[PDB]
Design a protein around this ligand. Structure first.
Ligand SMILES: O=c1ccn([C@@H]2O[C@H](COP(=O)(O)OP(=O)(O)O)[C@@H](O)[C@H]2O)c(=O)[nH]1
Ligand SMILES: O=c1ccn([C@@H]2O[C@H](COP(=O)(O)OP(=O)(O)O)[C@@H](O)[C@H]2O)c(=O)[nH]1
Ligand SMILES: O=c1ccn([C@@H]2O[C@H](COP(=O)(O)OP(=O)(O)O)[C@@H](O)[C@H]2O)c(=O)[nH]1
Ligand SMILES: O=c1ccn([C@@H]2O[C@H](COP(=O)(O)OP(=O)(O)O)[C@@H](O)[C@H]2O)c(=O)[nH]1
Lengths: 443, 439, 443, 436
């Protein structure tokens, strides 16, 4: 059994695949990870090198992707644009995969690359699997998109997905409904070819999304396999830990908005105003420059010296990559503020951190809903879309205060934390399924 | 400097012609949107749509999601025709989408099959409606008269007179056209009746080619005929570059028609008998490219090996415009579907006409009458009757042989060229049409 | 495999499983098979079954029909509303059938929807056939219901069909004898649409039902073909009989009440008590949910702790689904307790396993009658429609002991198995017809 | 300095030099400027200028598009269009643009681009207000007349003769017409238009564009020099008396034949003007040009070696024109050059070889900036005598009125350059409009 992982662009796409790959390797499959160059963000490149030196037996397959060529799919995002570039070049890898010395039994592809990858292994003896980065609830929305697009003539309230509670129209992203945009075209193109996949891997546990996992199973994606939460490859040298150790437990509030999400210039100053006003201890990851890490070459001239001095007693503001999974594990962090990209969300759940939900773009709003549903965190729907909306200091601060002091949440959040543990256990469903899956791989 | 939207109907024959026009309008400074629908019937349509847009970025594309097929009286057993029924129900979906188009629509060019439903869609909206017709004028004359024809017994009639043109033989009319329930008949009949509500009816033919019919249509209701043929290309060779000029015979039956297994064996045998170097495009999968998974298991292992010196046969989407243009090809064997015929004229390639179904027989006659190609009546309908290798062979040789025929096609080729010219009538008509659109 | 064949099963395991078997049989015999399914499936099991079929038999394509919203009133049955929701979307087979590459030479449609596809077989001239999943004697009663329900509609000791042993009214379901019930309308209307069919296949042979084959032949079904017993499909597993290996041959009683739950909880317990008294070693597959796989969430709350412990070393209980055919085939199994669903009855005869008959509902009672006549099993008539009467453990125990020690039955039962094989063998009568039908089909 | 801006010129120094000045001007006004360039660059000089510009301005970022596979300058302008999508990644990774200012030639391709990555876009024209309208009114004119007449009229603009108009622009078939006509149509998308002009130079011209639907035209002329400092070159410049030197530059490309060029070379010595001559060998390409000063002849060099100096290659024009020594300018009349002359107040003689320039010569005449002879016409068409030239050449040196008229023009240019004046005011305003 030889298994190959093909992640797309983004640390949200990259991190999950590497994490699984390490898990697969630990459980004894021969694992190859497919990377292509160049990569959009510095972290992906730096990470890949670190991952491989830590895991030596995993093979690295590197292919330089063809120069960006396109027609259609209006895209204004660098990570999405790279995904299109990888997808248009996946068909040129057929010659290489055919001749590999230890031939691949199966490929675990990225959702975005599933259509091109499914065509690629058509006449090769390789099972095709897809790993889903996002939540199961978002997958229900993805499955319903053709039905949603066909019967979506009216802009009114929410659409009832068939086996679970109806989602508000505000939660569905406007880009998803426009067929011209890449987000919609890629979502639609991949769901059509999901039927050619042997199994679809998900990063949620049965306890976390019982309705969403069950609804998809009866809605035609009958091969769904929950394997979440994914485990860290625990490879790390740089220590940014020291300030936290000084902090009392649970005092600190962690704010981060993912790998490639940035706030408005008015929002960065209003969020900073709220952090001061709240009086809470905090850790802020500032990603003012934007998605790309390389072009975000600025160095804390977003707030000014005046602000740092006021907050230094209660806060540390870090601009750069931070070891998020480690920070979350720390006794000091009792709160998290998230765009609710799923991988952060899953981590918050595994480590039991209360979450304050703040979607900016795409699936974040629905995932925010899941986060609210499970008690993981508090979500304010009225806030709506970050990047489409601005929230003042008064509003932000009160919520920040409220999350820090909800004991019901802290108690509730822990319960999810326990459930995530059970699933990893040998009895627990998620590990068992993977163990079940792994055997399958041997053919 | 106006917004005009073009809405095609299912199939390549109905899709390629619309795209070529959309590109053509864009060339002349028109803002253009193309209203496509999902999902497609065929891979080619989907593939072509994507390519077109990458090549003509200025052109907008509008995507519609199909409703499910709906029970209606009509009898249909064809995948493409069925899709047409589905697209037709779906037009009403359009209403809210039209009210928000970035630049307000000046007019919408709709398909003949989609004309009845589209005309009602914008009856209230201040939008001029035009329709573009895939088939020939000669067929069109038959279509216009169908509603009258539907009420007359017309049985045991060898031939039926058409009002300002000579009567078509019954032989060249599809039986299903004259049975009211069948979709083919119903869609043609229903749409003609609504034609009055269209400002103009665009036909992919030119005055030199179809002059008698073009007048004939005009004097019987449809005075809004605007021939602007032949539509330009919006925009397998390696074997060909090796070939001698004119030495190659090209066989194709279009994007949505396949030949019976018994018939197919005979055709290959004829090609072997003929000895003409040939490029044969084979569709064994009846109609669908997605479902035509068979890969030359149709001819046999032995067959190709013998024919390798004198032939190349492919199963797959050939580029028809480029193959015809190439110097080598000396004849076309065609179902005589109009778009194919129209490209045949443009490149002055002699055609041996073998209509298979539907409009094709009337079209076939125009091919012969024009002197473009030779058609034998006795062969009648393909997919209804099968003809021998021996008969097929003589005819295949003859088209290659005839030099008068080669000369005749050239006159057809020049006339086609003439219409394109700024002086020429068809190019002039499109421009006149363009002026009219009023923002 | 030149000829192109599609079989369409609408709903229920009993309907679904035989059709898959016919499909497998056709492919083995040189047809190219498409299998049509309608989603969402009523039960998890059909879906479980279908996915495995396609993965196990990969040269057979899967054609799915997505069902439309339904809302009719007059809650009946979940498989009867699904049988009528498949007829509310049976015009969605038009686009699919027109697109199929090698066009259909013949389609085999479940008898529940033969009246709705009539129009579809005229437009696209598909020679259509249908496979009956009931007994040949119960199909006779189904096939004469229209002519019997024209005359005085009432109940007598025995109602008679033309040329076969009169059927008692205690074997006939009461809802079939009232002409204003849903049931009759669907049966009367689909027997009228049997004249448009080119052949009618049934899952039986002529040694098993000699009179029914001729009674059905001399009463309006001259194109009836008995192709029984249907062959078994593959599944790849077996961690269901660790105890079965330890148990001695022919010593184990297999209790199955079919795809769905049968008797009331109170009644079952008496059998459980009954099983204990008998001493029969047993493998029991219990379906808690009387009709839905998805709905059944009960476990050890059906029989009580009291029983499960006492039989701990002598019998095992499996909740949910088991591979019934593989189990019966096992050397260990020596008796069968059945609800006498017809499909189950034909395999018992096919596998030569002795039956104790406990028909619960519907056609099962007539099947019980067939089992008796064949000499396949022991049947008690007075036990009655399920839940009609409560049967004491002592009465149940005696029949069970009688089944274990009844030698003539084994001899007769052994004799039935040889005949079933005889039909399957290439010279065989049932085998001959299936081979013949393919010969007729035209490319 | 909050606002962040990017410039994009495809080809020619006709466009790049102005764009860069636009880039520098924008940086001065508090704008984060990114300059986008196309590679490989057609000319070694074009490449040469860019490296210097970034190096001279550290704080202006450079973003580049590598290019995928008639006139080289026109064809390349065509190539940039092919690869325009390549722009898409670049915009996505930017540290996002408040606006982009793009070349006229490729505006049509970008329209799709602007709409997906929402960026307000502008174009800056390197041609005169009178000529832009001829481009601007061209599309209607071509379809309506389809004929050749001695003079043509742009609605509120005094008709200029066909003789000025370039022949290729006239032909419908020609590639040039498609580019010009198409692009103006695309002109609708832009939230502003900029031309290197001031109202005073062409009140009539600017108005017609305002009248004619180019409502959004903004004239920001003259553009400030983006320059190097300080090189000890032209010791031959400092030496001479004020206004003693005639500087000759026919372009950023060659313009006339060796025999036609020889007549001016012979005319120059008869004229007696001291001169600094910029002589380019390549008709259109600096890399292509590998000829020494043998078109003029050995003899010419020996005779005049004290009198004047000849530079083969490139020189800094603004730097040279600004000098006290320069009192006369001979120009091929490319607008960028013409504008430089007005801002520097140096009398011009107009000898336009090709294209827009003859119309540009007309503007000079209305202005009083320089002396022009219409009859000389399109370059290489006719041979103009050495004797005929000198009389005009001497006249340029010794005309008192011209000096006065020229003096005003420089004065007029400044007033717009200063804070009160409109060209300065609009720049201030546009930047203000720009939204973070
Ligand atoms: O400064 C950062 C930002 C993100 N992450 C990691 O990036 C992962 C993926 O982020 P997510 O998917 O939550 O958001 P996205 O980047 O996809 O929008 C998370 O697990 C974080 O651990 C990190 O380690 N440091
Ligand atoms: O393999 C093919 C088949 C079709 N065509 C083009 O498809 C168009 C449609 O053909 P037509 O409508 O005449 O036949 P139909 O598709 O209607 O049966 C014609 O322009 C052909 O040139 C092609 O280029 N390659
Ligand atoms: O637990 C089970 C129950 C049934 N079956 C099979 O599925 C069919 C269902 O039985 P039947 O239709 O005779 O009874 P019903 O469906 O009416 O309850 C039979 O062929 C059995 O062989 C099985 O494999 N496992
Ligand atoms: O030797 C030379 C020739 C030209 N230019 C510059 O060329 C630019 C643009 O020239 P213009 O567009 O007027 O002429 P063209 O490029 O059309 O020939 C002006 O800014 C001049 O300063 C220069 O600096 N040195």
């Amino acid at each position: 059994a030889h298994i190959a992982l093909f992640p797309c662009a983004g640390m949200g796409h990259l991190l999950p695949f590497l994490r699984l790959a390490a898990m697969l390797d630990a459980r004894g499959c021969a694992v190859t990870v497919i990377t292509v160059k160049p990569t959009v963000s510095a972290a992906e490149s730096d990470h890949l090198s670190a991952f491989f030196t830590i895991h030596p037996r995993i093979t690295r397959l590197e292919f330089q992707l063809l120069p960006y060529q396109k027609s259609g799919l209006r895209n204004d995002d660098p990570f999405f644009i790279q995904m299109e570039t990888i997808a248009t070049s996946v068909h040129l890898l057929r010659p290489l995969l055919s001749s590999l010395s230890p031939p691949l039994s199966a490929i675990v592809s990225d959702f975005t690359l599933t259509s091109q990858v499914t065509d690629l292994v058509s006449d090769l003896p390789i099972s095709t699997y897809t790993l889903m980065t996002s939540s199961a609830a978002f997958f229900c929305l993805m499955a319903y998109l053709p039905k949603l697009l066909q019967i979506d003539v009216a802009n009114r309230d929410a659409i009832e997905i068939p086996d679970l509670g109806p989602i508000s129209m505000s939660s569905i992203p406007p880009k998803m409904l426009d067929p011209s945009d890449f987000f919609s075209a890629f979502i639609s193109s991949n769901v059509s070819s999901l039927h050619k996949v042997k199994g679809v891997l998900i990063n949620t546990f049965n306890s976390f999304e019982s309705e969403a996992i069950e609804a998809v199973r009866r809605n035609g994606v009958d091969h769904i396999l929950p394997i979440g939460p994914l485990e860290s490859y625990d490879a790390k040298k740089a220590h940014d830990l020291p300030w936290l150790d000084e902090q009392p437990p649970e005092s600190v509030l962690f704010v981060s908005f993912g790998s490639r999400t940035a706030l408005s210039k008015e929002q960065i100053r209003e969020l900073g105003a709220a952090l001061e006003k709240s009086g809470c201890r905090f850790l802020w990851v500032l990603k003012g420059g934007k998605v790309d890490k390389e072009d975000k070459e600025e160095v804390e001239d977003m707030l000014g010296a005046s602000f740092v001095e006021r907050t230094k007693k209660k806060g540390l503001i870090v601009k750069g990559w931070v070891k998020q999974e480690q920070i979350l594990a720390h006794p000091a962090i009792g709160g998290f503020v998230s765009h609710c990209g799923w991988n952060s969300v899953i981590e918050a759940a595994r480590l039991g951190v209360p979450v304050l939900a703040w979607p900016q773009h795409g699936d974040q709003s629905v995932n925010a809903g899941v986060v609210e549903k499970a008690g993981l965190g508090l979500w304010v729907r009225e806030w709506g879309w970050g990047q489409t909306k601005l929230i003042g200091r008064e509003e932000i601060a009160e919520k920040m205060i409220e999350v820090m002091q909800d004991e019901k949440l802290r108690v509730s959040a822990g319960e999810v934390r326990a459930k995530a543990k059970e699933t990893r256990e040998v009895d627990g469903d998620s590990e068992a399924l993977l163990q079940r899956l792994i055997h399958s791989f041997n053919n």
